[PDB]
């Protein structure tokens, strides 16, 4: 038995990009899960082939990473085109892995046919038949139903942790204590709504030494609904396979919740944090039953008690190491049922 798993709008070659870095992950512990798999994209690379090189019913399986189906600047783009044309020859049920709520399986089709080089393709080519199952990192099938109720094929939903990926590569090495250079830090994109509010909340005017790492740049925010005077340092995107040792640079990582994530979704950011020397701070929003950790001290509801506890790590080293210590501890307890994550996730895929 052979499996394919594919990026169906993004190149995949390293870790320069997190759709490229998601992709080859879960290539990664798929395949250490004892499974024959190849990652098809663009071109042959390191980690991938080429879809022009195999042929896609030569594979049992095919699984799909989210991606977004729009065409920006309305010019084509061949990584989500060279997807679906792959993903429509296909004629067996397709997974996808739906990783980000905004990002549900829609076809292209329809997009290119308005497009002025619409005359390049064809709805034989582009149009995706075959049955689809969607596999929600987020527990709430309601919602994942909710962002697919314009999509005809997509036959059924089931739930499974995908973002623990990383927890369970097989080299897989907690963070090590760091020299600290950062009060908070948080490292990833801008997103508007409650995710940019959330992060002028809790990142901007907070009088601390906070780093916010990734493509996300001061400009973007600009919303008067969340006014703002002194932002916090930020320094460029990093490759996602660095994401926990810059986080241990910092006393404390945040996680901040979003529409439709908080009590839903547990997001990579969880346990890229958990397994950094930085303590784990929670936006009490993203988890109100202390789902992921059960000591209050790991949650912050607004500015104010960021800053409180972040200053209450900064003069106790005690409590910081102990703090540390229960996350690691739980991260641990959660790498331990590993077996059971993979039996999971093989069932989610019909093994
Ligand atoms: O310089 C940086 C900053 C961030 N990251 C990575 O980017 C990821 C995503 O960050 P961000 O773009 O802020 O999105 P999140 O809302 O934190 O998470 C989204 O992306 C995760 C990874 O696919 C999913 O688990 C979540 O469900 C999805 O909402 C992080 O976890 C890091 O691994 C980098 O690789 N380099
Ligand atoms: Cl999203
Ligand atoms: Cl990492």
Do not use: C
């Amino acid at each position: 038995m052979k499996i394919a798993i594919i990026n169906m709008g993004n190149n995949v070659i390293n870790f320069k990009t997190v759709p490229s870095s998601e992709t080859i992950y879960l290539f990664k512990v798929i395949s250490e899960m004892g499974l024959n798999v190849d990652i098809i994209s663009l071109k042959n690379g390191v980690y991938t082939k080429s879809f022009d090189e195999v042929d896609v019913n030569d594979y049992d399986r095919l699984i799909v990473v989210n991606s977004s189906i729009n065409f920006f600047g309305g010019k084509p783009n061949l990584a989500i085109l060279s997807a679906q044309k792959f993903m429509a020859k296909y004629k067996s049920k397709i997974y996808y892995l739906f990783t980000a709520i905004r990002l549900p399986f829609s076809q292209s089709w329809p997009n290119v046919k308005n497009r002025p080089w619409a005359y390049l393709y064809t709805e034989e080519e582009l149009l995706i038949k075959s049955p689809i199952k969607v596999i929600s990192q987020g527990i709430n099938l309601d919602i994942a139903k909710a962002a697919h109720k314009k999509v005809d094929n997509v036959i059924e939903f089931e739930y499974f942790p995908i973002e623990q990926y990383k927890i369970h590569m097989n080299d897989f090495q907690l963070s090590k204590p760091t020299k600290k250079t950062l009060d908070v830090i948080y490292g990833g994109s801008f997103r508007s709504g409650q995710r940019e509010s959330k992060m002028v909340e809790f990142l901007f005017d907070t009088g601390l030494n906070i780093e916010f790492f990734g493509n996300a740049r001061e400009k973007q925010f600009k919303n008067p609904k969340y006014p703002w005077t002194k932002a916090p340092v930020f320094t460029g995107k990093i490759p996602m396979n660095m994401v926990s040792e810059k986080n241990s640079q910092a006393i404390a990582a945040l996680i901040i919740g979003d529409k439709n994530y908080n009590d839903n979704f547990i997001t990579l950011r969880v346990w890229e944090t958990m397994a950094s020397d930085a303590v784990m701070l929670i936006d009490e929003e993203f988890d109100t039953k202390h789902r992921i950790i059960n000591d209050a001290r790991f949650y912050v509801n607004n500015r104010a008690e960021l800053i409180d506890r972040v200053n209450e790590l900064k003069h106790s080293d005690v409590l910081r190491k102990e703090m540390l210590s229960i996350q690691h501890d739980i991260l641990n307890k959660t790498r331990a049922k590993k077996a059971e994550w993979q039996d999971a996730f093989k069932k989610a895929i019909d093994l």
